[PDB]
Amino acid sequence: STIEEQAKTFLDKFNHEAEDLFYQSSLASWNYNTNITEENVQNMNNAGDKWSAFLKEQSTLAQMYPLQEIQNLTVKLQLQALQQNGSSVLSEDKSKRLNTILNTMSTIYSTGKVCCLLLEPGLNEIMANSLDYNERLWAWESWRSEVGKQLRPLYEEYVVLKNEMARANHYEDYGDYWRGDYEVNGVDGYDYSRGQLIEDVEHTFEEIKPLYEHLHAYVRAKLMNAYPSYISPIGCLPAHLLGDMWGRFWTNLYSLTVPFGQKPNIDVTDAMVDQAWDAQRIFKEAEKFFVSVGLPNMTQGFWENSMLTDPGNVQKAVCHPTAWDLGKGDFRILMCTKVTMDDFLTAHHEMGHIQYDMAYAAQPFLLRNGANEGFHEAVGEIMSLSAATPKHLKSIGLLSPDFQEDNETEINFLLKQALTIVGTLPFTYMLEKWRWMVFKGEIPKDQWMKKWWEMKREIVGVVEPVPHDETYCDPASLFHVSNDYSFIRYYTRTLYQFQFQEALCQAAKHEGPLHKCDISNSTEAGQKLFNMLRLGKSEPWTLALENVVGAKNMNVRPLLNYFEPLFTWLKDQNKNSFVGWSTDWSPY
Amino acid sequence: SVLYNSASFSTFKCYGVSPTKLNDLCFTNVYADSFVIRGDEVRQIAPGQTGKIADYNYKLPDDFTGCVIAWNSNNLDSKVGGNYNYLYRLFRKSNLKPFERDISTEIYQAGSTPCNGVEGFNCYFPLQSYGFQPTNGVGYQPYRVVVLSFELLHAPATVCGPKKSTNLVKNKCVNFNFNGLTGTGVLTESNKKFLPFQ
């Protein structure tokens, strides 16, 4: 026997044993997520202990296999994600010390009380619905003086420990670990080194600034009615006037900014009460969306094992919107589905991930994963975007076939989407580039506050509402930082949302703007969609993008076509105030 | 004929011999290979396939003159949370001829190191466990496949088919056929007797 022939024996040996252990790890955790019981806590720890020990002992037997003699454009990609060094490459002393920091930063963030008052929905309502300048300021200033102080010493050690871990896996700094997933090396023609990922984003960000300047000027000129003195017509915006605690989610600002009071958005909540919708017809109408397009249908066990109802009074638990994948043909969804419009738009988000896992059903367990971390959520965004067009809701049961698309109605529809998709784009791009310079050496350890505040005025446009010092720490109180996660997956999610939508809407005779498109009864747009979903981890992300769009690089052009009517209305409205912001202005 | 329209089987494919011609056809020896496999392994049971199940476990010839009976249970059998009752061979260092059973619990040798007894590296366990769970989809359900073997040798075939009998009309000059003797006459009653062995 040779090398590639004996390598296939270890794959089938591991796949026939990992799927049995991974199914017990997800089944034990599913019982705790559907019924609060102390007995289910021990079953999750016992199932996770055997899974964590079996994965580490099988990776050692694959270390002696050469990583350069297997050529098949499929098996080579499986060994790169299995023969990795991982967090156990360091010594036994620094291994247990690094895991302790990850548990302390998550405890303070989850128990951060302001005396008591919790974060959400505790301080979330104060930072949104308040209509005052001296009321919502105390909720933001006290959060940095209590949570930022307890996370400052735990964040300094997080930089030095994670930097040495990345250098042991043949890299430069810690920033290369998050970018190593997009890096492709070993195939033929589909190569993509790290020298190109650094320039793909910095170029498209220069063209989105004119779109952000018109959106930021509309929020600044709107708050001048409530308080003219506190808001400068040419200045920036304080950090306590963005809705979110960290200034990332601008969805709460939609309640204070309303362009049209005559033609508001559509509401399909009352239309489902008369048509008998007992939280079951939502999934039935959503099933047809994945049938007449060219995608596989559902299964019989999907409607009998996935808890999609209410726990009632005898049982109670949680239901965070997150898709599950138990494996071996078992797929369940844990979402409390009610009878309103909020649950109708979010039903198609996790539903797109179900068709993703069903694409690579005949593939081994080592290929049941996306090409990158920024592609899993990209499948759920293109399904929820088409599920919000009034034309899509007209051909189904709910809504009235007498409603037509109005020019003034689309103005309010693009405003709420610009405060979430591109609303967090400048904040994500700034926070991602700021952390990449800490591990390198461009930002000193004692110059975090001096660098973080001077970059917000030049990109986001947020000054200092209250003078601080070099002791506070703002980025350490983030859900994706205190729990060890990457923020680069959200930046590419907003760009890949419009790239995959323009390709499907082009074959469906829906050119021009993307807000009037409707993916329904289109067999051609469904064939190209299943190609990149079936590939999974078998092929790099460069091939998955060409099969739908046609290229291998990101582009901001499809992002501007969806906001074309919004960019024109903001230009003729913000011309009376000021287009831009002055970084030399300070409220104090 | 009664085993085709019984409405108790999922799939019923016949190769070579038609499913509507074996009712009155004689067969020498009739065999039945009853076994249970997975859902994706049902398509592999065909004269002319290959893989890891139809090559090392149950080998099928190039030509097949019979039917393939397979239904679904997924109840009265199987378990929740995994199946730990039956096993199946995955890899094997040597091939097997068609119509041959392998009951040797040997160890597959992937590398060049001698296995059979000692494991650890390049010596994996070939017998794998199933996954019959009623909470999965369709391709993960147990299907009991009963392969029928229809052979025709020089031995006198004693397995044919029941002939359909009719009524008995008398006092009429009609046609009859008794023991392959085609005749046309009147079947009138008789009082004399013949011999019991004739």
Side-chain angles (χ1 to χ4, degrees), chain B residues 50-81:
Chain B
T50 180
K52 301 301 179 180
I53 302 300
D55 295 356
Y56 296 155
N57 301 21
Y58 182 84
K59 181 60 180 60
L60 294 84
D62 300 330
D63 58 329
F64 206 174
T65 60
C67 300
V68 179
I69 300 180
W71 65 92
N72 182 269
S73 42
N74 207 30
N75 52 56
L76 302 183
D77 76 344
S78 170
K79 278 184 309 185
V80 49

PDB file of all heavy atoms in Angstrom, chain B residues 50-81:
ATOM      1  N   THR B  50     -20.088  -1.388  -6.886  1.00  0.00           N
ATOM      2  CA  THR B  50     -18.846  -1.535  -6.141  1.00  0.00           C
ATOM      3  C   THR B  50     -18.848  -0.551  -4.979  1.00  0.00           C
ATOM      4  O   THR B  50     -19.677   0.359  -4.908  1.00  0.00           O
ATOM      5  CB  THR B  50     -17.621  -1.314  -7.038  1.00  0.00           C
ATOM      6  OG1 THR B  50     -16.425  -1.461  -6.262  1.00  0.00           O
ATOM      7  CG2 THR B  50     -17.655   0.077  -7.652  1.00  0.00           C
ATOM      8  N   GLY B  51     -17.910  -0.745  -4.072  1.00  0.00           N
ATOM      9  CA  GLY B  51     -17.781   0.105  -2.905  1.00  0.00           C
ATOM     10  C   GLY B  51     -17.064  -0.639  -1.790  1.00  0.00           C
ATOM     11  O   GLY B  51     -16.186  -1.461  -2.045  1.00  0.00           O
ATOM     12  N   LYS B  52     -17.459  -0.325  -0.557  1.00  0.00           N
ATOM     13  CA  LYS B  52     -16.880  -0.946   0.627  1.00  0.00           C
ATOM     14  C   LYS B  52     -17.802  -1.964   1.282  1.00  0.00           C
ATOM     15  O   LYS B  52     -17.359  -2.686   2.182  1.00  0.00           O
ATOM     16  CB  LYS B  52     -16.496   0.127   1.654  1.00  0.00           C
ATOM     17  CG  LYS B  52     -15.498   1.151   1.138  1.00  0.00           C
ATOM     18  CD  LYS B  52     -14.204   0.486   0.697  1.00  0.00           C
ATOM     19  CE  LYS B  52     -13.214   1.507   0.162  1.00  0.00           C
ATOM     20  NZ  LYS B  52     -11.941   0.870  -0.272  1.00  0.00           N
ATOM     21  N   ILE B  53     -19.060  -2.039   0.861  1.00  0.00           N
ATOM     22  CA  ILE B  53     -20.029  -2.977   1.413  1.00  0.00           C
ATOM     23  C   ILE B  53     -20.339  -4.098   0.425  1.00  0.00           C
ATOM     24  O   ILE B  53     -20.375  -5.272   0.795  1.00  0.00           O
ATOM     25  CB  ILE B  53     -21.321  -2.247   1.846  1.00  0.00           C
ATOM     26  CG1 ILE B  53     -21.000  -1.165   2.879  1.00  0.00           C
ATOM     27  CG2 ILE B  53     -22.333  -3.236   2.401  1.00  0.00           C
ATOM     28  CD1 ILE B  53     -20.362  -1.697   4.144  1.00  0.00           C
ATOM     29  N   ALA B  54     -20.560  -3.750  -0.840  1.00  0.00           N
ATOM     30  CA  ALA B  54     -20.873  -4.735  -1.868  1.00  0.00           C
ATOM     31  C   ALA B  54     -19.642  -5.456  -2.400  1.00  0.00           C
ATOM     32  O   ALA B  54     -19.779  -6.307  -3.286  1.00  0.00           O
ATOM     33  CB  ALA B  54     -21.618  -4.067  -3.026  1.00  0.00           C
ATOM     34  N   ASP B  55     -18.453  -5.141  -1.895  1.00  0.00           N
ATOM     35  CA  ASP B  55     -17.218  -5.771  -2.345  1.00  0.00           C
ATOM     36  C   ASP B  55     -16.543  -6.608  -1.272  1.00  0.00           C
ATOM     37  O   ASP B  55     -15.945  -7.640  -1.589  1.00  0.00           O
ATOM     38  CB  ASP B  55     -16.233  -4.705  -2.851  1.00  0.00           C
ATOM     39  CG  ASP B  55     -16.738  -3.982  -4.085  1.00  0.00           C
ATOM     40  OD1 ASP B  55     -17.812  -4.355  -4.599  1.00  0.00           O
ATOM     41  OD2 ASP B  55     -16.059  -3.038  -4.541  1.00  0.00           O
ATOM     42  N   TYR B  56     -16.623  -6.196  -0.004  1.00  0.00           N
ATOM     43  CA  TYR B  56     -15.972  -6.913   1.082  1.00  0.00           C
ATOM     44  C   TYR B  56     -16.933  -7.685   1.975  1.00  0.00           C
ATOM     45  O   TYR B  56     -16.489  -8.590   2.688  1.00  0.00           O
ATOM     46  CB  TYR B  56     -15.162  -5.941   1.954  1.00  0.00           C
ATOM     47  CG  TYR B  56     -14.007  -5.286   1.230  1.00  0.00           C
ATOM     48  CD1 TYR B  56     -13.511  -4.057   1.644  1.00  0.00           C
ATOM     49  CD2 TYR B  56     -13.414  -5.898   0.134  1.00  0.00           C
ATOM     50  CE1 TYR B  56     -12.455  -3.455   0.984  1.00  0.00           C
ATOM     51  CE2 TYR B  56     -12.358  -5.303  -0.532  1.00  0.00           C
ATOM     52  CZ  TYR B  56     -11.883  -4.082  -0.102  1.00  0.00           C
ATOM     53  OH  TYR B  56     -10.833  -3.487  -0.762  1.00  0.00           O
ATOM     54  N   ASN B  57     -18.223  -7.354   1.960  1.00  0.00           N
ATOM     55  CA  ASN B  57     -19.194  -8.050   2.794  1.00  0.00           C
ATOM     56  C   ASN B  57     -20.021  -9.021   1.963  1.00  0.00           C
ATOM     57  O   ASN B  57     -19.830 -10.238   2.045  1.00  0.00           O
ATOM     58  CB  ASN B  57     -20.107  -7.048   3.506  1.00  0.00           C
ATOM     59  CG  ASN B  57     -19.337  -6.087   4.390  1.00  0.00           C
ATOM     60  OD1 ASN B  57     -18.135  -5.892   4.217  1.00  0.00           O
ATOM     61  ND2 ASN B  57     -20.031  -5.480   5.347  1.00  0.00           N
ATOM     62  N   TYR B  58     -20.943  -8.492   1.163  1.00  0.00           N
ATOM     63  CA  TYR B  58     -21.813  -9.297   0.306  1.00  0.00           C
ATOM     64  C   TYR B  58     -21.499  -8.945  -1.144  1.00  0.00           C
ATOM     65  O   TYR B  58     -21.921  -7.897  -1.641  1.00  0.00           O
ATOM     66  CB  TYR B  58     -23.283  -9.055   0.638  1.00  0.00           C
ATOM     67  CG  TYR B  58     -24.242  -9.898  -0.171  1.00  0.00           C
ATOM     68  CD1 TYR B  58     -24.550 -11.197   0.213  1.00  0.00           C
ATOM     69  CD2 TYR B  58     -24.842  -9.394  -1.318  1.00  0.00           C
ATOM     70  CE1 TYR B  58     -25.426 -11.970  -0.524  1.00  0.00           C
ATOM     71  CE2 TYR B  58     -25.719 -10.160  -2.061  1.00  0.00           C
ATOM     72  CZ  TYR B  58     -26.008 -11.448  -1.660  1.00  0.00           C
ATOM     73  OH  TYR B  58     -26.881 -12.214  -2.396  1.00  0.00           O
ATOM     74  N   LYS B  59     -20.759  -9.821  -1.819  1.00  0.00           N
ATOM     75  CA  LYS B  59     -20.370  -9.603  -3.205  1.00  0.00           C
ATOM     76  C   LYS B  59     -21.470 -10.094  -4.137  1.00  0.00           C
ATOM     77  O   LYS B  59     -22.000 -11.196  -3.958  1.00  0.00           O
ATOM     78  CB  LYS B  59     -19.055 -10.319  -3.514  1.00  0.00           C
ATOM     79  CG  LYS B  59     -18.559 -10.125  -4.937  1.00  0.00           C
ATOM     80  CD  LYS B  59     -18.314  -8.655  -5.241  1.00  0.00           C
ATOM     81  CE  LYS B  59     -17.817  -8.461  -6.665  1.00  0.00           C
ATOM     82  NZ  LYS B  59     -18.802  -8.952  -7.666  1.00  0.00           N
ATOM     83  N   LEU B  60     -21.813  -9.271  -5.134  1.00  0.00           N
ATOM     84  CA  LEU B  60     -22.844  -9.615  -6.098  1.00  0.00           C
ATOM     85  C   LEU B  60     -22.227  -9.907  -7.461  1.00  0.00           C
ATOM     86  O   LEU B  60     -21.289  -9.218  -7.876  1.00  0.00           O
ATOM     87  CB  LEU B  60     -23.875  -8.488  -6.245  1.00  0.00           C
ATOM     88  CG  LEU B  60     -24.764  -8.148  -5.043  1.00  0.00           C
ATOM     89  CD1 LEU B  60     -24.059  -7.206  -4.077  1.00  0.00           C
ATOM     90  CD2 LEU B  60     -26.087  -7.556  -5.506  1.00  0.00           C
ATOM     91  N   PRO B  61     -22.725 -10.915  -8.172  1.00  0.00           N
ATOM     92  CA  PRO B  61     -22.185 -11.226  -9.500  1.00  0.00           C
ATOM     93  C   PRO B  61     -22.511 -10.128 -10.504  1.00  0.00           C
ATOM     94  O   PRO B  61     -23.259  -9.186 -10.231  1.00  0.00           O
ATOM     95  CB  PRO B  61     -22.874 -12.544  -9.873  1.00  0.00           C
ATOM     96  CG  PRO B  61     -23.392 -13.095  -8.577  1.00  0.00           C
ATOM     97  CD  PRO B  61     -23.728 -11.902  -7.740  1.00  0.00           C
ATOM     98  N   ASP B  62     -21.928 -10.269 -11.696  1.00  0.00           N
ATOM     99  CA  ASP B  62     -22.175  -9.298 -12.757  1.00  0.00           C
ATOM    100  C   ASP B  62     -23.603  -9.399 -13.276  1.00  0.00           C
ATOM    101  O   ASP B  62     -24.255  -8.377 -13.521  1.00  0.00           O
ATOM    102  CB  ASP B  62     -21.172  -9.495 -13.893  1.00  0.00           C
ATOM    103  CG  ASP B  62     -19.736  -9.318 -13.441  1.00  0.00           C
ATOM    104  OD1 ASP B  62     -19.501  -8.532 -12.499  1.00  0.00           O
ATOM    105  OD2 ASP B  62     -18.842  -9.962 -14.028  1.00  0.00           O
ATOM    106  N   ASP B  63     -24.105 -10.618 -13.453  1.00  0.00           N
ATOM    107  CA  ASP B  63     -25.466 -10.856 -13.907  1.00  0.00           C
ATOM    108  C   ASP B  63     -26.273 -11.491 -12.784  1.00  0.00           C
ATOM    109  O   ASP B  63     -25.756 -12.313 -12.022  1.00  0.00           O
ATOM    110  CB  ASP B  63     -25.490 -11.757 -15.147  1.00  0.00           C
ATOM    111  CG  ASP B  63     -24.819 -13.096 -14.909  1.00  0.00           C
ATOM    112  OD1 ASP B  63     -23.867 -13.152 -14.101  1.00  0.00           O
ATOM    113  OD2 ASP B  63     -25.243 -14.093 -15.530  1.00  0.00           O
ATOM    114  N   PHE B  64     -27.543 -11.103 -12.683  1.00  0.00           N
ATOM    115  CA  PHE B  64     -28.433 -11.596 -11.641  1.00  0.00           C
ATOM    116  C   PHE B  64     -29.797 -11.886 -12.251  1.00  0.00           C
ATOM    117  O   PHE B  64     -30.396 -11.010 -12.883  1.00  0.00           O
ATOM    118  CB  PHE B  64     -28.563 -10.581 -10.500  1.00  0.00           C
ATOM    119  CG  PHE B  64     -28.925 -11.195  -9.175  1.00  0.00           C
ATOM    120  CD1 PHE B  64     -28.950 -10.422  -8.026  1.00  0.00           C
ATOM    121  CD2 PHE B  64     -29.229 -12.542  -9.075  1.00  0.00           C
ATOM    122  CE1 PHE B  64     -29.280 -10.979  -6.805  1.00  0.00           C
ATOM    123  CE2 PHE B  64     -29.560 -13.105  -7.857  1.00  0.00           C
ATOM    124  CZ  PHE B  64     -29.584 -12.323  -6.721  1.00  0.00           C
ATOM    125  N   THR B  65     -30.282 -13.111 -12.055  1.00  0.00           N
ATOM    126  CA  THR B  65     -31.589 -13.506 -12.565  1.00  0.00           C
ATOM    127  C   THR B  65     -32.570 -13.721 -11.419  1.00  0.00           C
ATOM    128  O   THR B  65     -33.083 -14.829 -11.232  1.00  0.00           O
ATOM    129  CB  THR B  65     -31.477 -14.776 -13.412  1.00  0.00           C
ATOM    130  OG1 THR B  65     -30.948 -15.841 -12.612  1.00  0.00           O
ATOM    131  CG2 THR B  65     -30.563 -14.542 -14.605  1.00  0.00           C
ATOM    132  N   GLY B  66     -32.833 -12.670 -10.646  1.00  0.00           N
ATOM    133  CA  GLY B  66     -33.746 -12.767  -9.526  1.00  0.00           C
ATOM    134  C   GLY B  66     -34.308 -11.429  -9.092  1.00  0.00           C
ATOM    135  O   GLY B  66     -34.155 -10.426  -9.795  1.00  0.00           O
ATOM    136  N   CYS B  67     -34.960 -11.402  -7.934  1.00  0.00           N
ATOM    137  CA  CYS B  67     -35.555 -10.192  -7.389  1.00  0.00           C
ATOM    138  C   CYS B  67     -34.846  -9.787  -6.104  1.00  0.00           C
ATOM    139  O   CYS B  67     -34.144 -10.585  -5.474  1.00  0.00           O
ATOM    140  CB  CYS B  67     -37.051 -10.387  -7.122  1.00  0.00           C
ATOM    141  SG  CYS B  67     -38.035 -10.797  -8.583  1.00  0.00           S
ATOM    142  N   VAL B  68     -35.039  -8.529  -5.719  1.00  0.00           N
ATOM    143  CA  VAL B  68     -34.457  -7.966  -4.505  1.00  0.00           C
ATOM    144  C   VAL B  68     -35.603  -7.448  -3.649  1.00  0.00           C
ATOM    145  O   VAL B  68     -36.236  -6.440  -3.990  1.00  0.00           O
ATOM    146  CB  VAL B  68     -33.448  -6.852  -4.811  1.00  0.00           C
ATOM    147  CG1 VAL B  68     -32.894  -6.270  -3.518  1.00  0.00           C
ATOM    148  CG2 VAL B  68     -32.323  -7.379  -5.689  1.00  0.00           C
ATOM    149  N   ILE B  69     -35.871  -8.131  -2.539  1.00  0.00           N
ATOM    150  CA  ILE B  69     -36.941  -7.763  -1.620  1.00  0.00           C
ATOM    151  C   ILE B  69     -36.342  -6.972  -0.467  1.00  0.00           C
ATOM    152  O   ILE B  69     -35.387  -7.426   0.178  1.00  0.00           O
ATOM    153  CB  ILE B  69     -37.687  -9.007  -1.107  1.00  0.00           C
ATOM    154  CG1 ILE B  69     -38.298  -9.782  -2.276  1.00  0.00           C
ATOM    155  CG2 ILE B  69     -38.761  -8.610  -0.106  1.00  0.00           C
ATOM    156  CD1 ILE B  69     -39.060 -11.020  -1.857  1.00  0.00           C
ATOM    157  N   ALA B  70     -36.898  -5.792  -0.206  1.00  0.00           N
ATOM    158  CA  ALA B  70     -36.415  -4.935   0.868  1.00  0.00           C
ATOM    159  C   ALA B  70     -37.550  -4.041   1.340  1.00  0.00           C
ATOM    160  O   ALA B  70     -38.214  -3.394   0.524  1.00  0.00           O
ATOM    161  CB  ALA B  70     -35.225  -4.086   0.408  1.00  0.00           C
ATOM    162  N   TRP B  71     -37.769  -4.007   2.652  1.00  0.00           N
ATOM    163  CA  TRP B  71     -38.802  -3.185   3.265  1.00  0.00           C
ATOM    164  C   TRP B  71     -38.188  -2.373   4.399  1.00  0.00           C
ATOM    165  O   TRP B  71     -36.974  -2.399   4.626  1.00  0.00           O
ATOM    166  CB  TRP B  71     -39.969  -4.043   3.771  1.00  0.00           C
ATOM    167  CG  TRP B  71     -39.595  -4.973   4.885  1.00  0.00           C
ATOM    168  CD1 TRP B  71     -39.671  -4.719   6.224  1.00  0.00           C
ATOM    169  CD2 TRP B  71     -39.087  -6.306   4.759  1.00  0.00           C
ATOM    170  NE1 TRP B  71     -39.242  -5.811   6.938  1.00  0.00           N
ATOM    171  CE2 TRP B  71     -38.877  -6.799   6.063  1.00  0.00           C
ATOM    172  CE3 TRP B  71     -38.788  -7.131   3.670  1.00  0.00           C
ATOM    173  CZ2 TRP B  71     -38.383  -8.079   6.306  1.00  0.00           C
ATOM    174  CZ3 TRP B  71     -38.298  -8.401   3.915  1.00  0.00           C
ATOM    175  CH2 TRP B  71     -38.101  -8.863   5.221  1.00  0.00           C
ATOM    176  N   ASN B  72     -39.040  -1.648   5.119  1.00  0.00           N
ATOM    177  CA  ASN B  72     -38.622  -0.812   6.236  1.00  0.00           C
ATOM    178  C   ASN B  72     -39.237  -1.346   7.521  1.00  0.00           C
ATOM    179  O   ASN B  72     -40.406  -1.745   7.534  1.00  0.00           O
ATOM    180  CB  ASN B  72     -39.030   0.647   6.015  1.00  0.00           C
ATOM    181  CG  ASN B  72     -38.576   1.556   7.141  1.00  0.00           C
ATOM    182  OD1 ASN B  72     -39.298   1.767   8.114  1.00  0.00           O
ATOM    183  ND2 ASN B  72     -37.370   2.099   7.011  1.00  0.00           N
ATOM    184  N   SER B  73     -38.445  -1.313   8.594  1.00  0.00           N
ATOM    185  CA  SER B  73     -38.983  -1.666   9.929  1.00  0.00           C
ATOM    186  C   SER B  73     -39.028  -0.359  10.724  1.00  0.00           C
ATOM    187  O   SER B  73     -40.121   0.235  10.796  1.00  0.00           O
ATOM    188  CB  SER B  73     -38.127  -2.707  10.597  1.00  0.00           C
ATOM    189  OG  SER B  73     -36.749  -2.422  10.406  1.00  0.00           O
ATOM    190  N   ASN B  74     -37.890   0.077  11.282  1.00  0.00           N
ATOM    191  CA  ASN B  74     -37.807   1.369  12.024  1.00  0.00           C
ATOM    192  C   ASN B  74     -38.795   1.314  13.189  1.00  0.00           C
ATOM    193  O   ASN B  74     -39.256   2.393  13.615  1.00  0.00           O
ATOM    194  CB  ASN B  74     -37.991   2.588  11.113  1.00  0.00           C
ATOM    195  CG  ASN B  74     -37.295   3.825  11.638  1.00  0.00           C
ATOM    196  OD1 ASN B  74     -36.268   3.730  12.308  1.00  0.00           O
ATOM    197  ND2 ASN B  74     -37.844   4.992  11.339  1.00  0.00           N
ATOM    198  N   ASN B  75     -39.071   0.111  13.695  1.00  0.00           N
ATOM    199  CA  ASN B  75     -40.024  -0.101  14.817  1.00  0.00           C
ATOM    200  C   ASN B  75     -40.039  -1.610  15.053  1.00  0.00           C
ATOM    201  O   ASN B  75     -39.616  -2.331  14.122  1.00  0.00           O
ATOM    202  CB  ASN B  75     -41.428   0.456  14.550  1.00  0.00           C
ATOM    203  CG  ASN B  75     -42.047   0.003  13.243  1.00  0.00           C
ATOM    204  OD1 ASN B  75     -42.175  -1.191  12.980  1.00  0.00           O
ATOM    205  ND2 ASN B  75     -42.459   0.957  12.423  1.00  0.00           N
ATOM    206  N   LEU B  76     -40.505  -2.060  16.221  1.00  0.00           N
ATOM    207  CA  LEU B  76     -40.469  -3.510  16.566  1.00  0.00           C
ATOM    208  C   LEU B  76     -38.984  -3.881  16.562  1.00  0.00           C
ATOM    209  O   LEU B  76     -38.659  -5.030  16.922  1.00  0.00           O
ATOM    210  CB  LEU B  76     -41.293  -4.343  15.578  1.00  0.00           C
ATOM    211  CG  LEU B  76     -42.767  -3.953  15.462  1.00  0.00           C
ATOM    212  CD1 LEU B  76     -43.502  -4.886  14.512  1.00  0.00           C
ATOM    213  CD2 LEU B  76     -43.434  -3.946  16.829  1.00  0.00           C
ATOM    214  N   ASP B  77     -38.083  -2.959  16.180  1.00  0.00           N
ATOM    215  CA  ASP B  77     -36.613  -3.191  16.205  1.00  0.00           C
ATOM    216  C   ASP B  77     -35.925  -1.827  16.339  1.00  0.00           C
ATOM    217  O   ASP B  77     -36.669  -0.826  16.430  1.00  0.00           O
ATOM    218  CB  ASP B  77     -36.140  -3.926  14.948  1.00  0.00           C
ATOM    219  CG  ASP B  77     -36.072  -3.044  13.712  1.00  0.00           C
ATOM    220  OD1 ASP B  77     -36.665  -1.946  13.738  1.00  0.00           O
ATOM    221  OD2 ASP B  77     -35.419  -3.460  12.735  1.00  0.00           O
ATOM    222  N   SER B  78     -34.586  -1.795  16.402  1.00  0.00           N
ATOM    223  CA  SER B  78     -33.804  -0.526  16.481  1.00  0.00           C
ATOM    224  C   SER B  78     -33.814   0.037  17.909  1.00  0.00           C
ATOM    225  O   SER B  78     -34.468  -0.575  18.778  1.00  0.00           O
ATOM    226  CB  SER B  78     -34.228   0.492  15.444  1.00  0.00           C
ATOM    227  OG  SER B  78     -33.636   1.758  15.693  1.00  0.00           O
ATOM    228  N   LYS B  79     -33.136   1.169  18.134  1.00  0.00           N
ATOM    229  CA  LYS B  79     -33.062   1.776  19.493  1.00  0.00           C
ATOM    230  C   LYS B  79     -32.917   3.296  19.383  1.00  0.00           C
ATOM    231  O   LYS B  79     -32.582   3.776  18.286  1.00  0.00           O
ATOM    232  CB  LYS B  79     -31.856   1.232  20.268  1.00  0.00           C
ATOM    233  CG  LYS B  79     -32.050  -0.116  20.950  1.00  0.00           C
ATOM    234  CD  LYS B  79     -30.851  -0.548  21.767  1.00  0.00           C
ATOM    235  CE  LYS B  79     -29.551  -0.473  20.996  1.00  0.00           C
ATOM    236  NZ  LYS B  79     -28.417  -1.017  21.779  1.00  0.00           N
ATOM    237  N   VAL B  80     -33.169   4.023  20.478  1.00  0.00           N
ATOM    238  CA  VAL B  80     -32.979   5.469  20.491  1.00  0.00           C
ATOM    239  C   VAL B  80     -31.615   5.775  21.094  1.00  0.00           C
ATOM    240  O   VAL B  80     -31.244   5.216  22.134  1.00  0.00           O
ATOM    241  CB  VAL B  80     -34.107   6.171  21.271  1.00  0.00           C
ATOM    242  CG1 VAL B  80     -34.329   5.504  22.623  1.00  0.00           C
ATOM    243  CG2 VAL B  80     -33.801   7.653  21.442  1.00  0.00           C
ATOM    244  N   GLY B  81     -30.860   6.650  20.434  1.00  0.00           N
ATOM    245  CA  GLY B  81     -29.543   7.027  20.901  1.00  0.00           C
ATOM    246  C   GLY B  81     -28.400   6.213  20.341  1.00  0.00           C
ATOM    247  O   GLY B  81     -27.268   6.359  20.818  1.00  0.00           O
TER     248      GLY B  81
END
